[PDB]
Enzyme design. Structure first.
Site, PDB file in Angstrom:
ATOM      1  N   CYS A  95       0.843  -1.167   0.000  1.00  0.00           N
ATOM      2  CA  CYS A  95       0.000   0.000   0.000  1.00  0.00           C
ATOM      3  C   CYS A  95       0.920   1.274   0.000  1.00  0.00           C
ATOM      4  O   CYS A  95       2.046   1.243   0.476  1.00  0.00           O
ATOM      5  CB  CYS A  95      -0.839  -0.024   1.258  1.00  0.00           C
ATOM      6  SG  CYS A  95      -1.918   1.355   1.538  1.00  0.00           S
ATOM      7  N   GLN A 113     -12.874  -1.114   4.044  1.00  0.00           N
ATOM      8  CA  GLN A 113     -13.424  -2.441   3.806  1.00  0.00           C
ATOM      9  C   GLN A 113     -13.851  -3.082   5.108  1.00  0.00           C
ATOM     10  O   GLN A 113     -13.187  -2.983   6.157  1.00  0.00           O
ATOM     11  CB  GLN A 113     -12.456  -3.289   3.023  1.00  0.00           C
ATOM     12  CG  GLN A 113     -12.156  -2.550   1.735  1.00  0.00           C
ATOM     13  CD  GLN A 113     -11.372  -3.381   0.773  1.00  0.00           C
ATOM     14  OE1 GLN A 113     -10.187  -3.119   0.524  1.00  0.00           O
ATOM     15  NE2 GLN A 113     -12.002  -4.429   0.261  1.00  0.00           N
ATOM     16  N   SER A 136      -8.371  -6.074  -1.177  1.00  0.00           N
ATOM     17  CA  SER A 136      -7.050  -5.511  -1.518  1.00  0.00           C
ATOM     18  C   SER A 136      -5.959  -6.552  -1.427  1.00  0.00           C
ATOM     19  O   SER A 136      -4.980  -6.463  -2.112  1.00  0.00           O
ATOM     20  CB  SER A 136      -6.651  -4.479  -0.509  1.00  0.00           C
ATOM     21  OG  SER A 136      -7.654  -3.551  -0.438  1.00  0.00           O
ATOM     22  N   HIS A 139      -3.747  -8.343   5.112  1.00  0.00           N
ATOM     23  CA  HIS A 139      -3.233  -7.219   5.983  1.00  0.00           C
ATOM     24  C   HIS A 139      -2.724  -7.707   7.372  1.00  0.00           C
ATOM     25  O   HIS A 139      -3.208  -8.708   7.915  1.00  0.00           O
ATOM     26  CB  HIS A 139      -4.304  -6.206   6.304  1.00  0.00           C
ATOM     27  CG  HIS A 139      -5.069  -5.701   5.129  1.00  0.00           C
ATOM     28  ND1 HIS A 139      -4.890  -4.435   4.624  1.00  0.00           N
ATOM     29  CD2 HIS A 139      -6.056  -6.261   4.387  1.00  0.00           C
ATOM     30  CE1 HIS A 139      -5.745  -4.216   3.638  1.00  0.00           C
ATOM     31  NE2 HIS A 139      -6.451  -5.320   3.464  1.00  0.00           N
TER      32      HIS A 139
HETATM   33  C1  LIG Z   1      -3.041   0.357  -2.297  1.00  0.00           C
HETATM   34  C2  LIG Z   1      -4.205  -0.117  -1.351  1.00  0.00           C
HETATM   35  N1  LIG Z   1      -4.335   0.195  -0.045  1.00  0.00           N
HETATM   36  C3  LIG Z   1      -5.491  -0.393   0.413  1.00  0.00           C
HETATM   37  C4  LIG Z   1      -6.042  -0.335   1.707  1.00  0.00           C
HETATM   38  C5  LIG Z   1      -6.961  -1.296   2.149  1.00  0.00           C
HETATM   39  C6  LIG Z   1      -7.534  -1.218   3.442  1.00  0.00           C
HETATM   40  C7  LIG Z   1      -7.151  -0.170   4.305  1.00  0.00           C
HETATM   41  C8  LIG Z   1      -6.241   0.817   3.881  1.00  0.00           C
HETATM   42  C9  LIG Z   1      -5.707   0.722   2.577  1.00  0.00           C
HETATM   43  N2  LIG Z   1      -6.072  -1.035  -0.629  1.00  0.00           N
HETATM   44  C10 LIG Z   1      -5.310  -0.906  -1.702  1.00  0.00           C
HETATM   45  C11 LIG Z   1      -5.611  -1.517  -3.124  1.00  0.00           C
HETATM   46  O1  LIG Z   1      -4.822  -1.255  -4.031  1.00  0.00           O
HETATM   47  O2  LIG Z   1      -6.557  -2.306  -3.347  1.00  0.00           O
END
Ligand SMILES: Cc1[nH]c(-c2ccccc2)nc1C(=O)O
Length: 145
Positions: A95, A113, A136, A139
């Site tokens: 990210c 999400q 995504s 995590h």
């Molecule tokens: C690049 C990125 N950061 C996040 C994300 C997801 C949950 C909480 C904060 C950032 N999703 C992405 C994605 O590319 O899907």
């Protein structure tokens, strides 16, 4: 026990431990709602991520399972104190928040999400999640406030 936490039996030791089904955390010690929380995370994307691309790698090709293996390695190093969370987030998170040691700032419910949000709101300040899966990718979340 607090939201999500259940007592389980260790499959190696026969010792009791505690598992949290909302944050996927697990620990030996027995554990212990704000409008807002602040979290950092470390994201490992895989080939089925909604966007299999990041600052680290133009085309992400690792499989979901290979991502979970990376996540588990980073959690072992964080928990052993061999590496700290901020430093693995900076180097290895997919990210763009990697550039802020994974820090996302403060957020309330209704913004992230849902699995990400529920894990964040079930951590207490200071605590870290296990692997949390969203569209995504996978995590590790650290609740900082
Ligand atoms: C690049 C990125 N950061 C996040 C994300 C997801 C949950 C909480 C904060 C950032 N999703 C992405 C994605 O590319 O899907």
């Amino acid at each position: 026990l607090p939201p999500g936490w259940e007592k389980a039996m260790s499959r190696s030791s026969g010792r009791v431990y505690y598992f949290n089904h909302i944050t996927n955390a697990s620990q030996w010690e027995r554990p212990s709602e704000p409008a807002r929380v602040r979290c950092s995370h470390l994201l490992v994307k895989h080939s089925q991520s909604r966007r299999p691309s990041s600052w680290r790698q133009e085309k992400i090709t690792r499989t979901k399972e290979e991502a979970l293996e990376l996540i588990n390695g980073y959690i072992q190093k964080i928990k052993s104190g061999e590496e700290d969370f901020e430093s693995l987030a900076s180097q290895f998170s997919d990210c763009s928040s990697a550039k802020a040691r994974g820090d996302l700032g403060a957020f309330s419910r209704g913004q992230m999400q849902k699995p990400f949000e529920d894990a964040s709101f079930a951590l207490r300040t200071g605590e870290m999640s296990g692997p949390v899966f969203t569209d995504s990718g996978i995590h590790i979340i650290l609740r900082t406030e």
